[PDB]
Amino acid sequence: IVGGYTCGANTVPYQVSLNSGYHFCGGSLINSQWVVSAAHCYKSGIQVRLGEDNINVVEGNEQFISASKSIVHPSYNSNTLNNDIMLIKLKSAASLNSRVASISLPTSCASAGTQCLISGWGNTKSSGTSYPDVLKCLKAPILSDSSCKSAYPGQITSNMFCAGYLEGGKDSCQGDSGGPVVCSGKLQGIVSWGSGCAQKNKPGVYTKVCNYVSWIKQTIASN
Numbered sequence: 001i002v003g004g005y006t007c008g009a010n011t012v013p014y015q016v017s018l019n020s021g022y023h024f025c026g027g028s029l030i031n032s033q034w035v036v037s038a039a040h041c042y043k044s045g046i047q048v049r050l051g052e053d054n055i056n057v058v059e060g061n062e063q064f065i066s067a068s069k070s071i072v073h074p075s076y077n078s079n080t081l082n083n084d085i086m087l088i089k090l091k092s093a094a095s096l097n098s099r100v101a102s103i104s105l106p107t108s109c110a111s112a113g114t115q116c117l118i119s120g121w122g123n124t125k126s127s128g129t130s131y132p133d134v135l136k137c138l139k140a141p142i143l144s145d146s147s148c149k150s151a152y153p154g155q156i157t158s159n160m161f162c163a164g165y166l167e168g169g170k171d172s173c174q175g176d177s178g179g180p181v182v183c184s185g186k187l188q189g190i191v192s193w194g195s196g197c198a199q200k201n202k203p204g205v206y207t208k209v210c211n212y213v214s215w216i217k218q219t220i221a222s223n
């Protein structure tokens with residue numbers, strides 16, 4: 001997260017770190033046995049780490065659970081990143097409490113202007129790599145479809161939305177992919193891609209979760 005602030009330990013209880021010996025992506029806990037992340041974060045050997053703040057220190061509240069299966073959306077396109085969503089089923093359910101909680105899926109899509117919270121352990125520099133130990137947060141608004149399409153002509157599908165600041169300075173970045181974009185208590189997006197990080201007129205692009213709720217529900221109900 002570039003231009004954000006330190007969240008404060010366990011203030012984002014639905015945030016998870018996907019780990020394979022190092023942190024490579026974020027994700028969101030939506031119930032006690034399922035996590036939603038981005039399809040491009042898929043790999044084998046995933047350990048899901050819940051209740052984290054400093055990802056390099058066991059401070060207490062952590063729960064490390066292996067993924068039993070990861071379900072990449074069947075129409076995921078790795079060239080356009082269209083349908084960049086994945087569901088991960090945990091080997092055992094997690095113990096929910098005030099430090100580990102799930103986030104609700106939305107019933108409707110959000111409108112431009114909506115203020116959301118984006119978080120993660122990704123790079124905090126736009127020009128260079130500085131990875132934090134604790135979780136960073138950024139409050140950012142959803143942009144209108146026209147500004148998004150004018151920024152990325154021909155690359156935005158109906159399953160994506162832009163959020164951020166066109167003046168540059170604040171954005172999600174590498175290491176944040178797969179994580180949450182929460183607006184009014186509902187998970188509206190998943191960190192997907194962007195051109196550089198925090199560059200002028202190149203906002204972050206997110207997977208539009210409201211378009212996949214029936215798919216998430218039906219898939220979880222059958223697995």
Ligand SMILES: NC(=[NH2+])c1ccc2[nH]c(-c3cccc(-c4ccccc4)c3[O-])cc2c1
Binds near residue numbers: 024041172204
């Ligand atoms: N400007 C943004 N808003 C933004 C958001 C998420 C991002 N993720 C990345 C990213 C960069 C290199 C590798 C990965 C990656 C690749 C495979 C698996 C996991 C992460 C990224 O997600 C860049 C990147 C940029």
Ligand SMILES: [Ca+2]
Binds near residue numbers: 053055062
């Ligand atoms: Ca820790």
Ligand SMILES: [Cl-]
Binds near residue numbers: 149153154155
């Ligand atoms: Cl277009």
